[PDB]
Write a protein that binds this ligand. Structure first.
Ligand SMILES: C[As](C)(=O)[O-]
Ligand SMILES: C[As](C)(=O)[O-]
Ligand SMILES: C[As](C)(=O)[O-]
Ligand SMILES: [Ca+2]
Ligand SMILES: [Ca+2]
Ligand code: NA
Length: 584
């Protein structure tokens, strides 16, 4: 039995046997000791898969042994056969499946939860490969920052995301929706009881899935620093955090991104005192997180030094506080190692990243369905906290989010093309190949001004198109390539028609306009080829009809709100329109 697709990619995986079939009922050893959340996740799986737990041990049944390094379970030590989570970093685990026994040992509880996650990905129709795995993340915090503008996620969207994060070993969710005044416009005041159950449902869902629910506060709207409105407003900040602490919040983020009010020393004072009086006082609270007013390299540095704010902020903030930045720009092609080194150097600490992809709020007509791209594979040298800013489109965000889980857990081995393919395969099953056709055309984000990021759209198709123009302007035979391109354009329309018919409403409601748009472009792309063949056949009537169709298909794509494949399927039409074979 083969190893299924896994996400994230485990650090170490060795195929050690032929694989075995899990029995209809199993022996469960260790559930009394092992991490509750981890056991609950196992039980949920076993139920959904029709695998019963024996009330009494039967040596003919499959044995599943679960626990932590701390625990003393001899059945665990036996089944692991020398493999252990003892030497592993936090969230690490060991997984051994060999000859009727599956053994999960976490370095800690989060770790046993993640082991279960790998187990659930390993098992297909009762069959499991025989493997030994030791696994642990590259980066210590890995998650989503809910920082996009436009229509907020629904409550159900959120619950589903949290469960999705847990399944793919993402441990951070920074909560900050624009339709929640208690994070900004009413930052001072605690949640009323009418909003309590909703917030409780998020806190509990997060805790169950080993996701740190980070509560992001943006006081900058109207926060006062100076004098006694300032001792007032700082105490309001404590009051709020205390009312959230009582609900179960153990992680906090304070934003200075939108304030116009701009004093590094004042922002950092609030942060430091909050840190001493709250986060250190509670003992229970994770390191404080902040977003400075200058949060991209262009805004932070000028002329080979930091700008005023950044120098003062870096000098004043406690070393234990987590500082976010977006890379070399707000939305940018890359975070090269050199940029992380620079910023990390200025702050004399490991940085946190806020990565603005797949967010599309700055160019909402296009969907960002690409992988993590442009992020240095050695980034962990200067960064120990990684978040992505997703789209308002929760369901379709899962594709790039899937790749972020792999990038941040197994950075050194991250392969953007393979990770992209794995995301669509795992998310879309039988609809995967059709989803690839469409999503391949919608990875590159570019608002034509300040914001651009992402793998280029449909690169292989781009290259074939370029080859066509090259052959045709070189008096070379392009017969076979013309045939091949007709096939690609027909395949584009076919895949989109399939997705329209078979995608669930939850995806379809996010992408239906972009599906129609790629159909229109595929049809304009076909017409474009018809122009070429017409010229080759010296059929002016066929040329003129195809030209009129191609121009129409281009014009509708340009007018529509939806945007896709600008540099490829769209641009090909304009290229064909302007091309004239008779001059070669
Ligand atoms: C600052 As933004 C990338 O959420 O528009
Ligand atoms: C084609 As590339 C190395 O910019 O992903
Ligand atoms: C570029 As033409 C042949 O439509 O004038
Ligand atoms: Ca335990
Ligand atoms: Ca358009
Ligand atoms: Na033409």
């Amino acid at each position: 039995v083969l190893v299924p697709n896994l996400n994230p990619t485990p650090e170490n995986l060795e195929v050690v046997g032929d694989g075995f079939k899990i029995t209809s009922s199993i022996n469960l050893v260790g559930e009394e000791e092992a991490d509750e959340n981890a056991v609950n996740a196992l039980r949920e799986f076993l139920t959904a898969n029709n695998i019963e737990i024996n009330s009494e041990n039967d040596p003919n049944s499959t044995t599943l042994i679960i626990g932590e390094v701390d625990d003393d379970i001899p059945e665990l030590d036996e089944a692991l056969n020398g493999t252990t989570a003892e030497n592993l970093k936090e969230e690490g685990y060991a997984l051994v499946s060999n000859d009727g026994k599956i053994a999960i040992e976490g370095k800690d509880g989060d770790g046993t939860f993640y082991g279960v996650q790998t187990f659930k990905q390993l098992v297909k129709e009762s069959n499991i490969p025989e493997v030994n795995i030791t696994d642990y993340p590259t980066v210590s915090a890995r998650g989503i920052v809910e920082g996009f503008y436009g229509t907020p996620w629904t409550h159900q969207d959120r619950l589903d995301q949290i469960k999705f994060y847990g399944e793919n070993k993402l441990n951070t969710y920074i909560y900050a929706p624009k339709d929640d005044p208690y994070h900004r416009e009413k930052w001072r005041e605690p949640y009323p009881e009418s909003e309590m159950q909703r917030m409780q449902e998020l806190i509990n869902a997060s805790a169950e899935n080993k996701v740190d629910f980070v509560f992001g506060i943006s006081p900058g709207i109207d926060i006062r620093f100076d004098g006694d409105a300032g001792e007032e407003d700082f105490n309001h900040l404590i009051t709020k955090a205390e009312s959230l602490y009582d609900m179960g919040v153990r992680s906090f983020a304070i934003y200075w991104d939108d304030i116009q009010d701009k004093s590094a020393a004042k922002h950092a004072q609030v942060l430091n005192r909050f840190n001493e009086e709250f986060v250190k006082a509670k003992g229970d609270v994770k390191p404080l997180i902040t977003v400075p007013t200058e949060y991209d390299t262009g805004a932070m540095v000028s002329n080979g030094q930091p700008r005023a704010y950044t120098r003062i902020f870096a000098e004043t903030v406690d070393p234990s506080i987590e500082v976010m930045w977006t890379g070399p720009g707000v939305v940018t092609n890359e975070i090269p190692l050199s940029d992380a080194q620079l910023i990390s150097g200025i702050y004399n600490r490991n940085m946190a990243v806020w990565w603005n992809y797949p967010v599309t709020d700055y160019f909402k007509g296009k969907l960002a369905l690409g992988p993590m791209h442009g992020l240095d594979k050695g980034l962990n040298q200067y960064v120990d906290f990684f978040t992505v800013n997703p789209m308002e489109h929760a369901e379709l965000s899962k594709i790039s989010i899937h790749t972020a889980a792999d990038y941040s857990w197994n950075m050194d081995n991250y392969d953007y093309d393979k990770a992209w393919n794995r995301a669509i395969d795992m998310l879309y099953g039988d609809l995967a190949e059709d989803m690839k056709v469409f999503a391949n055309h919608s990875t590159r984000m570019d608002n034509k001004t300040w914001a651009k990021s992402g793998r280029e759209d449909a690169p292989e198709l781009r290259a074939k198109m370029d080859e066509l123009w090259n052959k045709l302007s070189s008096k070379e035979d392009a017969s076979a390539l013309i045939e091949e391109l007709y096939g690609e354009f027909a395949r584009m329309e076919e895949a989109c028609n399939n997705l329209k018919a078979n995608l669930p409403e939850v995806a379809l409601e996010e992408c239906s306009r972009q599906l129609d748009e790629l159909i229109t472009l595929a049809q304009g792309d076909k017409a474009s080829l018809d122009m070429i063949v017409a010229q080759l056949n010296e059929d002016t009537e066929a040329y003129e009809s195809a030209k009129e169709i191609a121009q129409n298909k281009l014009n509708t794509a340009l007018s529509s709100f939806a945007v896709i494949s600008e540099k490829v399927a769209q641009s090909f039409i304009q290229e064909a329109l302007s091309f004239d074979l008779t001059l070669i």
